[PDB]
Design an enzyme around this catalytic site. Structure first.
Site, mmCIF file in Angstrom:
data_model
loop_
_atom_site.group_PDB
_atom_site.id
_atom_site.type_symbol
_atom_site.label_atom_id
_atom_site.label_comp_id
_atom_site.label_asym_id
_atom_site.label_seq_id
_atom_site.Cartn_x
_atom_site.Cartn_y
_atom_site.Cartn_z
ATOM 1 N N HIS A 49 0.895 -1.100 -0.103
ATOM 2 C CA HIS A 49 0.126 -0.116 0.078
ATOM 3 C C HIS A 49 0.959 1.332 0.111
ATOM 4 O O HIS A 49 1.982 1.214 0.559
ATOM 5 C CB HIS A 49 -0.913 -0.091 1.156
ATOM 6 N N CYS B 11 0.193 2.667 -4.451
ATOM 7 C CA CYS B 11 -0.457 3.959 -4.972
ATOM 8 C C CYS B 11 0.341 4.932 -4.350
ATOM 9 O O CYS B 11 1.370 4.997 -3.481
ATOM 10 C CB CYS B 11 -1.789 4.132 -3.917
#
Lengths: 163, 87, 87, 163
Positions: free
Chosen positions: A103, A151
């Protein structure tokens, strides 16, 4: 799994603007994969095993000895990167690959303990620092490839238009 | 004592642009990773990494469905990096 | 309505690495700028901008005297940018 | 001053992975040079006139109509960049060049009013934002080249070694 470069193909490529490759039988190429799949406060990254498999197989087939580390905090990632940069095999290597998969937010890559309240972030700046000429002299003049699947924020990354 | 550049011969390739999401299929894996593997398998023989990464970016050109645009960052490669697979 | 990438077809070329100085001669001008002009004059005909910028970086390879290392940043070029000078 | 690409040279380059170039007689290429030479709290950037001359001549010879702006604050640079992004000529252009030349620090490019006490900084992030698909739709799918002559900090950018 990689299409091979033929002897005539390599001769076609070879003049003074290419990174030199070490002898196959004596070289000790290293690569590192850090992949976070399980988190304290973020949903499981299902499918990450597919990513680890593919990247491991590819990098091995390109001649790299691949080390895989899973579910680490930013501090653990830092310790691992520091240890990786200190590996003597880099002296008899011609290049390296660093793969990060986790992440991510604008600030950087999420460690397993990351939360909005208590951040656990590895900054891209720190990765470069730990692998630079001062902290990793063995990879001076040698290509260092950093691959990051994450991301860089939560925006879908698009603008809409009528016409 | 002798001088050396503090930062040189780096290339970073990220899955999306700053601020923006990268996508991962729950069973098929991360799209950027899958796309990268496929292009490395095909073009490592004939193209340097910068060229390969550009080709990867091109594959994401059309913003169909779950759009993202991989980005090359902090490039200090002074030469072409060819992998010469098989050598 | 139709979707488009928010950020695409960019390339940045900076005079030095993050944290680090870039040099400018008081009468001869900025070294990075002068080096860039010379390489653009020579290689615009035959090389795309990414290649030209890489060549510029190579010229700074030896950290002699006032060392600096130009850097390419935030690259989302999906195609080769040739200037085709004369066309 | 630029070596020309011959008709056979252009045919050698031309397939589906090259940015398309517009017709010479109908295209309206634009480029912008922002150069800060005189500052309130930072020494004069002597030699900047040499930089402006060379970059102007080069970009003109590459087919760009060049606009030159001098000694601006970050806010003035922002206003100028916003106006530049809104120029209708970009619709009948195939590309653009943005040249920034000034003092710089880690955070970004210095405006004429910059001080350690009162910062006057144009961030690289803002330049990209002002020229992106939302704020500059006319340069969608077209190469945007940003050139920056500035320090990115005050470090000489070197490490020392004995052996």
């Amino acid at each position: 799994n990689v299409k091979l470069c033929s002897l005539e193909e390599a001769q076609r490529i070879w003049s003074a603007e290419i990174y030199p490759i070490m002898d196959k039988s004596s070289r000790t190429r290293l690569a590192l994969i850090i992949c976070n799949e399980e988190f304290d406060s973020i949903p499981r990254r299902t499918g990450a095993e597919v990513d680890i498999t593919g990247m491991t197989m590819l990098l091995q087939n390109l001649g790299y000895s691949v080390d895989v580390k899973k579910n680490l905090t930013a501090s653990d990632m830092t310790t691992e990167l520091e240890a990786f940069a200190h590996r003597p095999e880099h002296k008899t290597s011609d290049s390296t690959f660093l793969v990060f998969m986790s992440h991510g937010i604008r600030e950087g890559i999420c460690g397993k303990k990351h939360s909005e309240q208590v951040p656990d972030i590895l900054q891209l700046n720190a990765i470069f620092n730990m692998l630079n000429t001062k902290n990793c002299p063995s990879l001076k003049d040698k290509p260092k490839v950093i691959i990051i699947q994450a991301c860089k924020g939560d925006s879908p990354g698009v603008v809409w238009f009528k016409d | 004592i002798k001088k050396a550049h503090i930062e040189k011969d780096f290339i970073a390739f990220c899955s999306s642009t700053p601020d923006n999401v990268s996508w991962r299929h729950p069973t098929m894996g991360s799209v950027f990773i899958g796309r990268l593997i496929e292009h490395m398998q095909e073009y490592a023989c004939s193209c340097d990494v910068e060229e390969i990464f550009r080709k990867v970016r091109f594959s994401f050109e059309q913003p169909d469905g779950r759009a993202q645009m991989p980005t090359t960052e902090r490039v200090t490669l002074t030469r072409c990096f060819y992998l010469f697979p098989g050598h």
